[PDB]
Amino acid sequence: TCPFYKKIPGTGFTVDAFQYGVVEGCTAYFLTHFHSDHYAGLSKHFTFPVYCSEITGNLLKNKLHVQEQYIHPLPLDTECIVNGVKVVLLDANHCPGAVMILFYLPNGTVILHTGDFRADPSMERSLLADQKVHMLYLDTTYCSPEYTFPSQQEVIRFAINTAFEAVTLNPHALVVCGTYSIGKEKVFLAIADVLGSKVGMSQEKYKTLQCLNIPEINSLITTDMCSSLVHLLPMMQINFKGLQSHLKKCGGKYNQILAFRPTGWTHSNKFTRIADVIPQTKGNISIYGIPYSEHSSYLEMKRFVQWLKPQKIIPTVNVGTWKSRSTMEKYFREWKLEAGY
Ligand code: NI
Numbered sequence: 001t002c003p004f005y006k007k008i009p010g011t012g013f014t015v016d017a018f019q020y021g022v023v024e025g026c027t028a029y030f031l032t033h034f035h036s037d038h039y040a041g042l043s044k045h046f047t048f049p050v051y052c053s054e055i056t057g058n059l060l061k062n063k064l065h066v067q068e069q070y071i072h073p074l075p076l077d078t079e080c081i082v083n084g085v086k087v088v089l090l091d092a093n094h095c096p097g098a099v100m101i102l103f104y105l106p107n108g109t110v111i112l113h114t115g116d117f118r119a120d121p122s123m124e125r126s127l128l129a130d131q132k133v134h135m136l137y138l139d140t141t142y143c144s145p146e147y148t149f150p151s152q153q154e155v156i157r158f159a160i161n162t163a164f165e166a167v168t169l170n171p172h173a174l175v176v177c178g179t180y181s182i183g184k185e186k187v188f189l190a191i192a193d194v195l196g197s198k199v200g201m202s203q204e205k206y207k208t209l210q211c212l213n214i215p216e217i218n219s220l221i222t223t224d225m226c227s228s229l230v231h232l233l234p235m236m237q238i239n240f241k242g243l244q245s246h247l248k249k250c251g252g253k254y255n256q257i258l259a260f261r262p263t264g265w266t267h268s269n270k271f272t273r274i275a276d277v278i279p280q281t282k283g284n285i286s287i288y289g290i291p292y293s294e295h296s297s298y299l300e301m302k303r304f305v306q307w308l309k310p311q312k313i314i315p316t317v318n319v320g321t322w323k324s325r326s327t328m329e330k331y332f333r334e335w336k337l338e339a340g341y
Contacts, residue, residue, distance in 0.1 A: 005137065005314050008113070010105045011085055015113050015137070018042045027083050032115025033098035034059040035181055042066060051082060053089060055097030058211035059182075077127060090126055092117040094294050095183030096212045102127065112308070113137040114316075119296040119304035128308065136310035140317045141295045143328050147265050148298070149291040150274045156190045158274050159260060159290055163191045166258045167229070173256040175230045176246065178238035182208060183294050184262045189220055191260075192230040200228030226253075235261065240282045247285075256284045262292035302335055309341040 006017040012027030018041035023029075031039060031052045042050070044065040049072055052060070057073035060066040074080050076089050076099070086104040094116045103111045112133050149155075167173050175195070177188040192199045199221045201209075206223050214220075222228055233246065238261050247257055258279075268277075269291055279286040296304070305313070313332050318324040 003319075005316055005319060008103055008111060010107060010109065011103065012083055013085070013103070015101065016115070018046070022048075030101055030113075031056060031060075032101070032113070033092065033095055034063075035095065035116065035183075038116075039064070046070060051087075053097045053099050055211065055213055056099075058213075059097070059208070062211055063208065088127055090123075090128070093120050093123075094118060095181070096185070096214070097182075102133075109134050111135045111137070112310070114139045116141070116294070117296060118294055119300040121303070123304065124307050133308055133310050135312045135314065136305065136308065137314045137316050138301075138305070139295060140301075140315040140328055142265060142293075142298055143301060143315070143318065143331060145298045146270060149265055149269055149293045152186065152292060154274050155262075155290055155292045156186055158277065159187060160190050160194045162288065163258065164194045166256075167195055170256050172254050173258055174247070174250065174254040176238070176243065176257055176259040177230065177232055178235040178259070178261045179205065179232050180235040182212070184292055185209070185212075185214065187260060187262045187290070187292055188230060188232055192220065192228075195229060197229045198222040198224075198227065199230045199232060200225040201232040205232055225250075229254075238287065240285055240287075243285050243287075257286070259285070259287045261287060261289045263289050264293045264295060265291060302331075305332075306335050306339040306341075309339070 002014060002017050002020040002023050006014050008015065012025060013030060014023055014026050015030045016032055016038040017023055018029060018039060028049050028051055031050055034056050042064050044067060046066055047070060050060065050070055051072045051074060054073040057071045060071055061068060074089050076091060080087055088102040089099040092098040092100050092115050098115060100115055100117060101113045110131055110133050114137065116139050163175050175191055188199050201221065203223055206221060209217060209221055225231060238259050243257050243259055247254060266289060279288045315328050318328065
């Protein structure tokens, strides 16, 4: 049964609620983004209207085979009417196709659902600037002050400089990047651009990337592993055993691997600067964990909420324990007292 924080009051709508069967009273199912914890339950047998971004709707049709007649893609930054209710989709700064949803209820209440997001000051100049928001359904993934990480731009600068140095020292080194979902494509695309290479990958991952409307993508990715010196592998294979095995498969073209695991936060964030990050190494294999996040840091989250000044906050992440819920509520009250709303 569907939890209350997935239901939009005063509407027939749910958000990211496909794993509960037929939800009583739902007339339209919204999907914020194509990550499995959010789409869990969708398939070719789904017969209710799904509302989403264009990119999300490409992934539903090609990867999950949802029939076309039930996919309702909406343009971003555009007022649309859905079952008698005005809505707007906004870029969430998460993975490709990810959106936040603004609902303008018939009684005058305005609700923002962030989906998954990485808050940014650029959001302060979207269509959010123009009216008051009463209720915020918030991605609270990293809602505690210990969660610090660098900007995405600093992390990509480190990755490109690290890869370019290694491969210039040894032209026979292969670069490998881990993946298990969409998101974080800048990691492998930026590294392949500095090296003058396409990115090589499985047919299943190439298919996924071809749904994403990335400009000039045919110029950047390939299924011909032998022509590429940046390879994508499943995240589970980014360990010394899995990388040794991969190196065997390359037929003596390469004699070294430099591998990247883009994680979110890890407790090595509480001590070390990005500049000072070092790899784990075993023989001719080196593995870097890099803190590339597609969710808000604590400070980014706090800035957004203190700008928006919502009357009520509903967390959507970390809701299963009393300790987590009490911690989050204490920070919300702090933010409100500091800012004066
Ligand atoms: Ni997500």
